[model samples]
Target: PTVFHKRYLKKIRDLGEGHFGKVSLYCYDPTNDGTGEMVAVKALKADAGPQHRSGWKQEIDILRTLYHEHIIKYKGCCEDAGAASLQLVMEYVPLGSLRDYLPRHSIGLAQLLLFAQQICEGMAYLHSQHYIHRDLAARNVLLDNDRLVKIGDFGLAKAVPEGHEYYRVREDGDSPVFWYAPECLKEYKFYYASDVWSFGVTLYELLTHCDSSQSPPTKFLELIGIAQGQMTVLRLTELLERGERLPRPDKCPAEVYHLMKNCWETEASFRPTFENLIPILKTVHEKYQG
Candidate 1:
């Protein structure tokens, strides 16, 4: 059932907007009116369609039942049948998402490694819940003021049977192709392992930011080629079918990047599960933290 108090909530500022919804900074108090403690509120856009409603309901239902520190905290939701949109409130992350934020920094080795672990821990929790995050990327990993990373944006997630751990992904839909494993790019398949592959690419991006040159991301050439009149999506698909993997980042730690490679393994079965990955990432985090 939907749960929220429309009167207690107030929008403070706009964060971002999309066809699905507009997320804004908000506060909840009888008299706050945008002056109380802040929260991030995702509300249906004014012109949202049925597709947006289905996605909104799905993520709201997921958040209501799920709880993990590295997962975005959902406070509650607000419904207004007479209004243009409904709102879902979550713990506000002042630092914003890992997407452009990661690239904006001159990160140290220790901090970079820690963030990789944080995101992986979030992934571990989602997989444990039998959800495969179809769109696992820096953009979906949010950062708080304390620098903790939480995996959010579950609209593309698919719930599979506990033991089977697989979902039939649509091949034609929009997704981060560069972060995908060859299996997912060629076949309409997705699972926890596909998420593992995406995590690897995100980690690589984290490490790349620390590099002296910060050269273009690996296989970034595919997108770059279009600007130069080199090739097309068909050629990009062909390259992936041939089993291309991102080259190791020169600045990446030995063991951490090895884990990245393992995650990007051509055969999905070769990748380790999140349950198995957490401990290793924890140890690596300590190695860098010290």
Candidate 2:
């Protein structure tokens, strides 16, 4: 399908919402068959400005160009005249995100390790495509039936040029400071290794079953003593620079925790690439499964 028409889109309900946009569950029934395809349509707020507009367009383009079993499937896009923005259309993964799902379920260690492996698989594919998934967290991963994992949300993804090793950001904006690697926090530079750092955080979240108490912000703030106005980032940088990292989560095996620490290496090059992580995670998952 090319451009999705507004008439066929039957809004079921709002799936999620954030500062600049909201995703809604919709049934696209162009054939009037009533068995319309269920889809998730992401639309920017009516009051979104230029920055939001450009990001939305980029996300649509990125999603359209990528196709992998572990990545969210993009269907098409809709033009909303009333909102004066484009609506990103995609397949609706019923289970939503790991961040939202894990806290409610009593999943075992082996299963959680499986999820980590799947995330690395998707990250490997994304890196192979020369694109960096700047936002890689439990919240951005979607779960389908049979426990399939899909890396969603390309709003912050940027394609690195063929010859460039990293992309430099010149604009100032909201970023996932806590999940960022050291180089990213200090230098505005995003490398493929930066995503590896985020994967470590996501792995921690998975081991904790996305528990609120062990959440990244909560844990980091507790360590840094949230008593400052604008010194939080600086504090986090200093702590990470000095080789400090999140403590081992309860029930997380020493080996798994060590793997997480490996991902958090101070030097970006010291971190393992997603490609190298696949077999390691597979081995760990198998051991824990037994």
What's each prediction's TM-score?
0.85, 0.96
Model 2: CA > 4 A from native? 31-33, 170-173
Worst 10 residues of 2 by lDDT: 169-178
Can you write out model 2's per-residue Cα lDDT over 12-61, one digit (the tens) per residue?
Answer: 99988878888999999989886789999999888989978887888888
Candidate 2 to native Cα RMSD, angstroms = 1.5
Residue 188: error of model 1 in Å?
1.0
Model 1 lDDT per residue over 87-106, tens place? 77788887877665766766
Regions of model 1 farther than 4 Å from truth: 1-3, 33-35, 80-85, 210-219, 222-224, 227-233
